[PDB]
Amino acid sequence: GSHSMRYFYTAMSRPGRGEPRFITVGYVDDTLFVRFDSDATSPRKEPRAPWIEQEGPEYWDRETQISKTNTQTYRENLRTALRYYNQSEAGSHIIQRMYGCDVGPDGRLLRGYDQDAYDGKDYIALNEDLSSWTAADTAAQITQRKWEAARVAEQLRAYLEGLCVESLRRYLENGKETLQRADPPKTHVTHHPISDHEVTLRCWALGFYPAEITLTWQRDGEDQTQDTELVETRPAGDRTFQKWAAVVVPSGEEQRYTCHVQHEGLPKPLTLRWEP
């Protein structure tokens, strides 16, 4: 199926408590495979997935260098961001970055990203054309002029179209046993009386991967969108995820409701009900 690789930067300043902490994590779909922490004893890129360990020693050193240089780049970016917003040097601030590429089954570039955020708000982002930028304000505009001058988009496009997809393609092969395996969810409905007139029906989905999934409750065939309680998908801790959709139905009308499940690990969308 489709796949994606993404890198996430987190540069948090901490006034009076040392230099800003820089963190990097690489993900392939919903799996984490690399991590860099400027706070670690020996700051360097470390493997987080079995299939990445087989990379040559040059790999790990090349990657660790990038992150080290980036540690400085973004620490400088945090200082620069302070001036752009006329902010004090006594407050803590955060810069976030998430970029990467998406590919279809044929492993071809589908889309590319590179977004930067400051204190949670959008700052600047590379447009889908991979050649133009979008500045959220006059401050990010300054950064845009710099990036256009230093031909940054050009460099990113090159990566996004070359190395990004190439390395991802290689990663998918080495970890095909897991990265290319979709585990369907395990489902069941629970019955929990709320009163003498209403009861709660909860549709569960467990041990599935990837995280993407769709749970819906239907009343006589009608989706109970604005009526269903849908908890945020959560990680089980074993690479798989969990999620449930609940709906309060009148007692004696439980058979008028049906739960629908959609996951790429299932050949056909599922449908279940309360099983007394």
Binding site: Y59, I66, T73, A81, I142, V152, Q155
Partner: peptide
């Protein structure tokens, strides 16, 4: 793999 590419604000 990450690219080099330096992005100074």
């Amino acid at each position: 793999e990450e690219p080099t590419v330096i992005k100074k604000y």
